[PDB]
């Protein structure tokens, strides 16, 4: 189905034999060492805990997005009565519950799993400080800055290879290495988490799945780095050579942490800046781990980028942007066709107005430097009642975000995310008006899909108020504010 709010306001955009074989002994041994070292590193200072029912309730009520009934499933003491029961089973080492019932069972499982392994996300075990290479909890407003730090590290090009169907390439060996978490746990906690882990052995909820994919991808890049640096090679794949074991152990212990900070890793998405370009041909362990690269012959050298500003990560590239007061932002950027395309899809008049509004406010926060999106966002916001709370999923590409899910003034939240809470903004002086929030540079805007300079869009910009009026009329008699004369 089509969002008719974005539709009526974006007129120019109209006419647009199974696999993962288990690894060989050599590779399994190196991964084992690497995953042993990484777990010990991620457990450095934090210590595991169970997550509470209250925490789960708080987590259900915010973002991201089903949940219509989740909120409703929680306060029902019959739901915590099945949960109580199934938890009592998990503690024996038995599981079975993983309409009313066959929805409660599904949601219960998510709680049990959040109770037992939730600490990985909630305490940011994969956050950059704790994981060195991870980026958990960072919005798009932060990631570019991380790419600029990674690119700051001297060496080869920056690589960013995708895997050919990641979840498909997880081996039993990856699973056992992930399951070492258990060794960090004791008591009930350990029994409960053991029950959750032993479920995929018979399919996690993205809560845990992201943490575990990131953990595993971090390790995979560590191994590919070792091989690029000549610590291991082709002759170590089947069986590790004469005393390479300790060479590998001491390589982890003395380089692991530095090398982690040459990475930005989100689930199956990774960016790595190795010591040199030998990395481009380090494919022996990679391929034998079944982590085959997408869209490239098994043994062709990888290619990388020189400029951090064009490396893709979480479907965006990132750019430096100079504001009128001389300050520099680093901002996300992706094809504008994909951005408007996504907002024109509706996955009810109020509900779709509220979703258009979240797309608009999402754009105002993340993609304000795009001329068309800034204009379209204000049209949307002008056409949807001021008091309608933005609703619905706008972030496909599940990272974090959601600061746009509000009724608060968008200049105020822009200031909070881009200045006040931006740790890469030294000078904390606020921006007083939208006109001081910068655009990207005509030529760059045009490069990423802008229609500026086009006729269809000229007559759209000039007539925009007619379209806004048309949407106001369909939605009906409500309070509207004009945001067009802040452009
Ligand atoms: Zn169960
Ligand atoms: Zn761009």
Q: Write out the H or E segment, with its range, that includes residue 252.
A: helix 244-260
111-114, Cβ contacts within 8 angstroms, sequence gap of 24 or more: 111/53, 111/56, 111/83, 112/83, 112/86, 112/87, 112/192, 112/195, 112/196, 113/196, 113/204, 113/205, 113/207, 113/208, 114/51, 114/55, 114/56, 114/59, 114/207
What distance in angstroms lies between residue 319's CA and the mean position of ligand 2's atoms? 7
For ligand 1, the distance from its centroid to the CA atom of residue 67, given in whole angstroms, is: 21
Q: Strand locations in 334-384, DSSP E? A: none
Q: Where are the domains of the chain?
A: 1-17+315-487, 19-50+118-314, 51-117
- According to the 3-state scheme, what is the secondary structure of 121-149? HHCCCCCHHHHCCECCCCCHHHHHHHHHH
Ligand 2 centre to CA of 307 (Å) is 13
Quick one: residue 271, left, alpha or beta (phi over 0 = left, psi -120 to 50 = alpha)? beta
Cβ atoms within 10 Å of 126's Cβ, excluding its own: 25
Taking the CA of 116 as reference, the closest ligand is: 1
* Dihedrals phi, psi of 322, to nearest 5 degrees: -95, 120
Q: How far is the CA of 134 from the centre of ligand 1 (A)?
A: 30
Instruction: Show binding-site residues for Zn(2+).
Output: 86, 90, 95, 98, 317, 333, 448
Ligand 1 centroid–CA 189 distance in Å is 14
Burial 109-119 (b: 16+ CB within 10 A, else e): bbbbbbbbbbb
Looking at residue 183, the DSSP 8-state letter turns out to be G
Closest C-alpha to 196, from 122, 108, 79? 108
Q: How far is the CA of 55 from the centre of ligand 1 (A)?
A: 20
Question: Solving technique for this entry?
Answer: X-ray
- How far is residue 10's CA from residue 356's CA, in Å, rounded to a whole number? 12
Q: How far is Cα 390 from Cα 358, in angstroms, rounded to an integer?
A: 5
**CA 82 – ligand 1 centroid, Å:** 10
Q: Residue 436: what are its φ and ψ, rounded to 5°?
A: -90, -10
Helix (H) or strand (E) holding 487: none
**18 CA distance to ligand 1 centroid (A)?**
28
Cβ contacts of 79-83, under 8 Å, gap ≥ 24: 79/104, 79/107, 79/108, 80/53, 82/108, 83/108, 83/111, 83/112
CA of 96 to the centre of ligand 1 (A): 5
CA of 42 to the centre of ligand 1 (A): 27
Residue 109: partners with Cβ closer than 8 Å, 6 or more residues away: 86, 97, 98, 205
Ligand nearest the Cα of residue 337 is 2
- For ligand 2, the distance from its centroid to the CA atom of residue 431, given in whole angstroms, is 23
| Measured CA distances, 314 to 110, 218, 273, 317, 340 (Å) | 25, 16, 17, 8, 17
Nominal resolution in Å?
2.5
Q: How far apart are CA 7 and CA 1, in angstroms?
A: 11
**Phi, psi of 266, deg, nearest 5:** -120, 100
The Å distance, Cα 444 to ligand 2 centre, comes to: 7
Look at residue 118 and give its three-state secondary structure. coil
Distance from C-alpha of 102 to C-alpha of 277, rounded to nearest angstrom: 52
Six-digit token pair at 134? 């991870």
User: Rounded to an integer, what distance in angstroms lies between the CA atom of residue 408 and that of residue 414?
Assistant: 11
Could you say which ligand is closest to the alpha carbon of residue 109?
1
φ, ψ (nearest 5 deg) of residue 313: -155, 135
- Under a CB-based contact definition with an 8 Å cutoff, are residues 366 and 334 in contact? no
Q: 262, 272 in Cβ contact below 8 A?
A: yes
**Strand pairing report for 269-272 and 263-266:** antiparallel
Cβ proximity of 292 and 298 under 8 Å: yes
Q: Point out the ligand nearest to the CA of residue 446.
A: 2
Ligand 2 centre distance from Cα of residue 218 (Å): 27
Q: Say which ligand is closest to the CA of 98.
A: 1
- Which ligand lies nearest to the CA atom of residue 339 in the structure? 2
The alpha carbon of 383 and the centre of ligand 2 are apart by a number of angstroms equal to 27
Cα 112 to ligand 1 centroid, rounded to whole Å: 8
Instruction: For 313-412, list the strands marked E by DSSP.
Output: 317-322, 328-333
CA of 32 to the centre of ligand 1 (A): 29
Shortest-distance ligand to the CA of residue 312: 2
Q: Among candidates 304, 297, 257, which has minimal Cα distance to 279?
A: 304
Closest-approaching ligand to the CA atom of 319: 2
Q: Please say whether the beta carbons of 288 and 27 come within 8 A.
A: yes
Distance 205 CA to ligand 1 centre (A): 13
The binding site comprises: 86, 90, 95, 98, 317, 333, 448
Q: Are 395 and 401 in contact (CB under 8 A)?
A: yes
Is the CB of residue 126 less than 8 Å from the CB of residue 211? yes
CA 415, CA 434: separation in Å to the nearest integer?
Answer: 10
Q: How far is the CA of 481 from the centre of ligand 2 (A)?
A: 30
Ligand 2 center from residue 167 Cα (angstroms): 29
Helices 371-383 + 455-475 axis angle, to 10? 20
The separation between CA 150 and the C-alpha centre of its own chain, rounded to angstroms, equals 18
Question: Which ligand has an atom closest to residue 97 CA?
Answer: 1
Ligand sitting nearest the alpha carbon of 366:
2
447 Cα: distance to centroid of ligand 2 (angstroms): 7
Could you say which ligand is closest to the alpha carbon of residue 333?
A: 2
User: How distant, in Å, are the alpha carbons of 26, 238, 242, 254, 277 from that of 235?
Assistant: 9, 7, 11, 23, 20
Helices in 93-238 by DSSP H: which ranges? 101-117, 119-122, 128-131, 140-150, 172-178, 187-200, 206-228
Phi-psi region of 314 (alpha: psi -120 to 50; beta: other; left: phi over 0): left
The whole-angstrom separation of Cα 127 and Cα 324 is 33
HSE value, Cβ hemisphere, 13 Å, CA-based, for 172: 7
User: Is cis: bond before 167, omega within 30 of 0?
Assistant: no
Residues in the chain: 487
| 467: Cβ contacts below 8 Å, ≥ 6 apart | 8, 9, 11, 379, 383, 460
Residues 219/155, Cβ–Cβ less than 8 Å = no
For the domain spanning 51-117, the CATH number is 1.10.260.90
CB distance 320 to 328 below 8 Å: yes
Residue 413 near residue 71, CB atoms below 8 Å: no
198 contacts 304 by C-beta, under 8 angstroms? no
Terminal Cα distance for the chain, rounded: 31
């Amino acid at each position: 189905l089509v969002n008719g709010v974005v539709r009526l306001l974006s007129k120019p955009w109209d006419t647009i034999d199974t696999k993962a074989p288990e690894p060989p002994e050599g590779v399994k041994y190196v991964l084992n060492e690497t995953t042993n070292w990484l777990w010990a590193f991620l457990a450095r200072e934090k210590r595991p805990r169970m997550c509470s029912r209250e925490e789960f309730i708080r987590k259900v009520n915010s973002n991201a997005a089903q949940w219509r009934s989740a909120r409703e499933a929680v306060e029902d003491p019959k739901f915590w009565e099945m949960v109580d029961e199934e938890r009592e089973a998990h503690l024996r080492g038995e599981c079975h519950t993983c309409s009313r019932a066959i929805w409660f069972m599904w949601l219960g499982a998510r709680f049990l799993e959040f109770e037992a392994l939730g600490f990985l996300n909630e305490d940011h075990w994969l956050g950059r400080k704790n994981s060195g290479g991870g980026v958990e909890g960072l919005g798009l407003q932060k990631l570019g800055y991380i790419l600029r730090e990674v690119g700051t590290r001297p060496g080869g090009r920056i690589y960013a290879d995708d895997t050919a169907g990641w979840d498909t390439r997880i081996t039993r060996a990856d699973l056992e290495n992930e399951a070492k978490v258990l060794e960090l746990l004791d008591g009930e906690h350990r029994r409960l988490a053991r029950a959750i882990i032993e479920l995929t052995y018979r399919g996690s909820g993205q809560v845990v799945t992201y943490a575990l994919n990131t953990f595993t991808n971090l390790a995979v890049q560590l191994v590919r780095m070792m091989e690029g640096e000549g610590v291991i090679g082709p002759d170590d794949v089947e069986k590790l050579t004469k005393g390479k074991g300790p060479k590998v152990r001491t390589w982890l212990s003395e380089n692991g942490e530095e090398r982690l900070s040459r990475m930005a890793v989100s689930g199956d998405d990774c960016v790595v800046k190795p010591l040199d370009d030998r990395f481009a041909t380090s494919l022996h362990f990679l391929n034998a781990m079944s982590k085959v690269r997408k869209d490239i012959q098994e043994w062709k050298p990888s290619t990388g980028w020189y400029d951090w500003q064009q490396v893709p990560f979480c479907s965006n590239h990132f750019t430096e942007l100079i504001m009128k007061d001389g300050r520099t932002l680093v901002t996300p950027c992706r094809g504008q066709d994909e951005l408007v395309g996504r907002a024109r899809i509706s996955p009810n008049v109020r509900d779709t107005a509220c979703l258009a509004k979240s797309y608009a406010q999402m754009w105002l926060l993340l993609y304000f430097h795009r001329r068309d999106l800034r204009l379209m966002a204000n049209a949307i916001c002008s056409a949807v009642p001021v008091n309608w709370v933005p609703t619905g999923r706008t972030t496909w590409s599940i990272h974090a975000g959601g600061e746009w899910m509000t009724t608060e003034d968008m200049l105020e939240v822009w200031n909070r995310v881009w200045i006040e809470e931006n740790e890469w903004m030294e000078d904390k002086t606020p921006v007083e008006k939208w006109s001081d929030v910068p655009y990207s540079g005509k030529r760059e805007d045009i490069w990423c899909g802008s229609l500026i300079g086009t006729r269809a869009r000229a007559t759209w910009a000039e007539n925009i108020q007619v379209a806004i009026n048309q949407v106001r009329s369909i939605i009906g008699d409500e309070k509207y504010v004009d945001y067009m004369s802040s452009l």
